[PDB]
């Protein structure tokens, strides 16, 4: 019957119009948190350099490239 | 001969006096059935409008004029 197909179309339209929870707030936040870790891991060496008295060129950084540009 | 003509007249009288089967019922029933179908065709759009939440003025009918006023 036509009414059943029209009900099916109405259900499809209802499902297609679901509200998107704006996921950008999540992803970016996690990314920032990740940076908060990586740069934080450097606090160990820099302090160890400063308390040792080495210059900037003599301070060895065990830094590996991060895909978020650090 | 006269008797042959009178027999012809009698046969004409019998043929003219046939019983009419009261055909009004068939025409009335057919018209009512077609009005039934035409009005039931609007159930789909009315139900979709009601289940969608539209107001009376915002429900668009596909109705076209019917030669029967119903």
From TrEMBL, chains A, B:
The chain crosses the membrane at residues 1-20. Disulfide bonds join 49-59. It comes from the Bacteria. The pili are polar flexible filaments of about 5.4 nanometers diameter and 2.5 micrometers average length; they consist of only a single polypeptide chain arranged in a helical configuration of five subunits per turn in the assembled pilus. Belongs to the N-Me-Phe pilin family. This is Fimbrial protein. It comes from Acinetobacter higginsii. The chain holds residues 9 to 78 of 150 of the full protein.
């Amino acid at each position: 019957t036509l009414i059943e197909l029209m009900i099916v179309v109405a259900i499809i339209g209802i499902l297609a119009a679901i509200a998107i929870p704006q996921y950008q707030n999540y992803i970016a936040k996690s990314q920032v948190s990740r940076v908060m870790s990586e740069t934080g891991s450097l606090k160990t060496v820099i302090e160890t350099c400063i308390l040792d008295g080495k210059t900037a060129a003599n301070c060895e950084l065990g830094w590996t490239n991060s895909n978020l540009l650090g």
